[PDB]
């Protein structure tokens, strides 16, 4: 009833949206992995009379439910999607999106890693993002490659109209106690990559992590802190 949703408040197999700013929503779904349940976030950004989607809802059925929830709550067509790294919480559901007429995009690095590891593969490559500090425009957002962090391919997304920074899985929520799933991470480079984000988006007003609750700029420093302590 207005609070940021968690696993306890999302009915089984469903998705919830949360209004972040004018024309900006997050999407929240839950999924089981290795016998535990986790929430995960994505982003929706109004693009005129269309919508840009950032990240799937972690799974085919969750992503179909996402599309239904968008139609119910917003009622504008999703025409493009960007996946911000190659893991299943970002690309799992790309096949559903593609069959629903959504053009799917990711960096060439993400596409290669998804293909090699057996995850679903976005159709279109996003050039211009291969060096840390690179930025490109994509509809109503800027895409930024901060360097290796949670994964070597992770992208962040900024919504300039609203000063919303979507960190994806390179950014953790304030309550986090460790650096999440570090299977593919570069813990030594991650603080440098977060520093780049801090330097590039100093006016961010809302910071959204890949999993958990949004907050302010403090999520960036907190992320650096938990990652350094994890590595240590
Ligand atoms: C789908 C995703 C994932 C699956 C299951 C869980 C997660 C988390 C996560 C875990 C705990 C917390 C609470 S916290 C910050 O307090 O620790 C959190 F916020 C996020 C994250 C994230 O951190 O993004 N991703 C997850 N995969 C699976 C994989 C890849 N692989 C191989 N062996 N190959 C493991 O790597 C990874 O990321
Ligand atoms: Zn991941
Ligand atoms: Zn993640």
From TrEMBL:
It catalyses: a beta-lactam + H2O = a substituted beta-amino acid. The modification Cysteine sulfinic acid (-SO2H) is found at residue 169. Zn(2+) 2 binds at residues 89, 169. GO terms for biological process: antibiotic catabolic process; response to antibiotic. One of its GO terms (molecular function) is beta-lactamase activity. Zn(2+) 1 binds at residues 85, 87, 89, 150. Zn(2+) 3 binds at residues 89, 169, 211. Keywords: Antibiotic resistance, Hydrolase, Metal-binding, Periplasm, Plasmid, Signal, Zinc. Class B beta-lactamase which confers resistance to the beta-lactam antibiotics, including penicillins, cephalosporins and carbapenems. Acts via hydrolysis of the beta-lactam ring. Has penicillin-, cephalosporin- and carbapenem-hydrolyzing activities. Monomer. This is beta-lactamase. It comes from Pseudomonas aeruginosa. The gene is blaVIM.
């Amino acid at each position: 009833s207005g609070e940021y949703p968690t696993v306890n408040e999302i009915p089984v197999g469903e998705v919830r949206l949360y209004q972040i700013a004018d024309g900006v929503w997050s999407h929240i779904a839950t999924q089981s992995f290795d016998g535990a349940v986790y929430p995960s976030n994505g982003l929706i950004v109004r693009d005129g009379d269309e919508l840009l989607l950032i990240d799937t809802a972690w799974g085919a059925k969750n992503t179909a439910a996402l599309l239904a929830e968008i139609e119910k709550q917003i009622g504008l067509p999703v025409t493009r999607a960007v996946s911000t790294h190659f893991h299943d919480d970002r690309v799992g559901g790309v096949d559903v999106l593609r069959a629903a007429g959504v053009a799917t995009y990711a960096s060439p690095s993400t596409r290669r890693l998804a293909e090699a590891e057996g995850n679903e593969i976005p159709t279109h490559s996003l050039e211009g993002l291969s060096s840390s500090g690179d930025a490109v425009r994509f509809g109503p957002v800027e895409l930024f490659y901060p360097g290796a962090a949670h994964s070597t391919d992770n992208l962040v997304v900024y919504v300039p109209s609203a000063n919303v920074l979507y960190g994806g899985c390179a950014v953790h929520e304030l309550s986090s106690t460790s650096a999440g799933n570090v299977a593919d991470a570069d813990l030594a480079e991650w603080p440098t990559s977060v520093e780049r984000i801090q330097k590039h988006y100093p006016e961010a007003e809302v910071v959204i992590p890949g999993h958990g609750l949004p907050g302010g700029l403090d999520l960036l420093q907190h992320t650096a802190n938990v990652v350094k302590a994890h590595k240590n």
